[PDB]
Design a protein around this ligand. Structure first.
Ligand SMILES: CCCCCCCCCCCCCCCCCCCC(=O)O[C@H](COC(=O)CCCCCCCCCCCCCC)COP(=O)(O)OCCN
Ligand SMILES: CCCCCCCCCCCCCCCCCCCC(=O)O[C@H](COC(=O)CCCCCCCCCCCCCC)COP(=O)(O)OCCN
Ligand SMILES: [Fe+3]
Ligand SMILES: [Fe+3]
Lengths: 277, 277
C-alpha cells in the first residue's frame, strides 16, 4: 500500500532503482534501516527532529577553511576511531593507527633533521627522535615523517592563521639510510577541541569535557608500506583515560625525559615507528 | 581500559556525565549504538567516511533562506514521514497528518474567503472549498486554514524570490460559524524537489526520481484541537505510487471536478477537515 511504520524500512529501500549488490545500495539499505530503528527505538518527537535538523545544519555551516565540525562530530561520537579500527588492522609489532583528526595539512615544508618546527617559540622546547623500521626490523631509507602539533596556547596553526606563523609545529622529514629522524619542537599541550559550535554544545549537554591529552601527530609513509596515521601521547597526561575522541592506545604513549643535562632542549621524546608491507 | 571495536558503544556512551534517564542520554545512547552498528554492519571504508563528511557538510552549507537541504534529506529517506507517523495516533474519522515538507512559511496574509491566492496567474484556476468540523460532526468556528502550494512552474514562492510575488499560492483563512472555507488558487502540479544539491545527487546515485505528486498543503489549527499538518493529493497523479517523500495516504487523495459551466475557475476541489482533541 503506502508508507506504514511497520514497513518504513522496506518502503524507503524498495524505491532504489540500482541493483541490490551495488555498494551504494548495500550502504544505504543499512543506513536507512539503522536510522529508522533509532527513531522508533527512542520515539524521536517532531520538536526533537527539528532540533536535530537545526544542529546538523549549523554543523555544516560552521565548516570551512580552518574548521571541520563534522569531523569533530564523528570524532567525539567515536565514529572516526571506529572507522580507523575496522579498516587499518595490522600485525603485532607494527605501530598502530589512530584517529586522524581534522588538523593535518598536506605539503608541509620538507625540513632538515635537527630543524626547529616551533616557529613562534611558545612552549617548552623538546627534541623528538627515533627510527623508522619495517616489520622485519630493518631501518627504512627515504621514509617521510610528517608531523604536526598544537602550540602552548592549545591551538594548531590553521586555527589561528593570522596569529601563528604558517607551518608552526609542522614539518616533513625524510629518513637517511639508518631510518632515523630527529627534530626540535615543543612539548605538546592538552587541548580542548573547538567547542564554540554544535559539537561543544552537545558535549556540554552530555556532561562531557572537550579535552584531548597532549600528543604529537606522525604521518609516516614509505614506498611499499601501509600509511601510518598515528600520534604519540605524553605519558602521565591527566586525560589519557578520558580522551574526547577516544584515540589513546597504550603502545602510543611516549616517554618524555626532562633535560637539565642536555640543555639544548628542556625535554626529549624518543619513539620508533614500525611500518608494514 | 581503552577504545576497542567490540566495546565501541559502551566506551563512547560511558563518557556521558548526565543521568542515564535524562532524555539526552536516552537518545544519544541509542544514536551511538545504532550509528556504530551501521558502520560495522557494512564496513564503512575511510574513503566512504570522507565522502559522508563532505556530503553532510555540503548539505548544511547549501541550506539558507530558501532551501532546507537537511529537511529534504530527512524527507527523501522517509525519516520525516516516520516521525510524523509515530507521533500521531488519532481517532478514526479525524483527518490524518502527513509530512510537513520544508516550504511552510509562517505569517502568511490572512485573506477573505473567496480570495485568490494565485498572484502570478500561472496554472489552471481552481476553487477550493470544504468544512472544518470536530469528530462529533459539529462545524468549528475560528479554525485557521493555512494553505500553500507550488505554482505551475513547479516552485514555491520562496524558491524564486526575484520572480514569484511574495505569498504566491499562500494564505490563511479563518472559518466562520458554519466551519466553511473557500478560496481560489491553481490546480497543483507535480514537482521535483530541488535536485541540484546533495539530496539530488544521492537520489540520482540510487536511481530514484525527485518527484512528488501534485498536492495542496493545509495546516489547520483551532483552540482545543490537535494541529492538523496535512496535504491533499490530486486524484490520479501518476506519482501517487512513487512519492519521493513517502507522504501519500489514501484518504488525503482529493477529487478534482472540471468546471466548463462556471469558467470562473476551470476546476473545483472539495475537502473537509475533521480535527480532534
Ligand atoms: C536526515 C535526517 C535528519 C534528522 C534525523 C533526526 C535525528 C534525531 C536525533 C537527535 C535528537 C536529539 C535531541 C534530543 C532532545 C532532548 C534532549 C537533548 C536536548 C534537550 O534537552 O533539548 C533542548 C536543549 O538541548 C540543547 O540545548 C542541546 C542539544 C543539542 C541538539 C541535540 C543533539 C543533536 C543531534 C546530534 C546530531 C546527530 C548525529 C549525526 C550523525 C531543550 O529541551 P530541555 O528539556 O533542555 O529544555 C528545558 C529547559 N528549560
Ligand atoms: C557523526 C558524523 C558521521 C560521519 C559519517 C560516517 C558515517 C558513514 C556514512 C557513509 C555513507 C556513504 C554511502 C555512499 C555510498 C558510496 C559507495 C558507492 C560508490 C560511489 O562512489 O558512489 C558515490 C555515492 O556517494 C554519495 O552519493 C555521497 C555520499 C552521500 C551519503 C551520505 C548520506 C548520509 C545521511 C545522513 C543522515 C543523518 C543521520 C543522523 C543520525 C558517488 O557519489 P555521488 O552519488 O554523489 O555521485 C553521483 C551523483 N548522483
Ligand atoms: Fe591533534
Ligand atoms: Fe509541497
Amino acid at each position: 500500500t503506502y508508507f506504514t511504520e511497520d514497513q518504513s524500512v522496506d518502503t524507503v529501500n524498495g524505491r532504489m532503482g540500482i541493483d541490490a549488490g551495488d555498494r551504494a545500495a548495500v550502504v544505504m539499505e543499512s543506513l536507512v534501516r539503522h536510522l529508522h530503528s533509532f527513531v522508533k527505538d527512542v520515539g524521536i518527537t517532531q520538536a526533537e527532529w527539528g532540533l536535530a535538523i537545526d544542529f546538523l545544519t549549523r554543523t555544516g555551516q560552521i565548516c570551512g577553511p580552518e574548521r571541520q565540525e563534522f569531523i569533530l562530530l564523528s570524532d567525539t561520537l567515536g565514529v572516526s576511531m571506529l572507522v580507523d579500527a575496522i579498516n587499518h588492522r595490522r600485525p603485532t609489532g607494527a605501530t598502530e593507527n589512530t584517529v586522524f583528526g581534522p588538523f593535518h595539512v598536506e605539503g608541509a615544508p620538507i625540513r632538515q633533521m635537527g630543524d626547529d618546527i616551533s616557529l613562534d617559540g611558545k612552549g617548552e622546547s623538546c627534541l623528538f627522535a627515533g627510527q623508522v623500521r619495517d616489520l622485519d626490523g630493518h631501518p627504512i631509507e627515504g621514509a617521510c615523517v610528517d608531523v604536526w602539533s598544537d602550540n602552548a596556547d592549545g591551538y594548531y596553526d590553521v586555527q589561528q592563521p593570522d596569529i601563528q606563523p604558517q607551518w608552526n609545529n609542522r614539518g616533513r622529514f625524510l629518513t637517511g639510510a639508518d631510518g632515523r629522524y630527529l627534530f626540535r619542537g615543543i612539548k605538546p599541550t592538552a587541548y580542548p577541541i573547538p567547542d564554540d559550535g554544535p559539537v561543544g554544545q552537545l558535549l556540554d549537554r552530555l556532561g562531557r569535557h572537550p579535552y584531548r591529552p597532549a600528543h604529537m601527530h606522525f604521518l609516516v609513509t614509505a614506498e611499499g608500506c601501509e600509511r601510518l596515521v598515528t600520534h604519540t601521547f605524553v605519558e602521565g597526561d591527566s586525560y589519557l583515560e578520558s580522551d574526547a575522541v577516544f584515540g589513546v592506545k597504550e603502545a602510543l604513549i611516549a616517554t618524555y625525559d626532562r633535560n637539565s643535562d642536555d640543555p639544548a632542549t628542556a625535554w626529549s621524546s624518543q619513539y620508533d615507528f614500525v611500518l608494514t608491507r
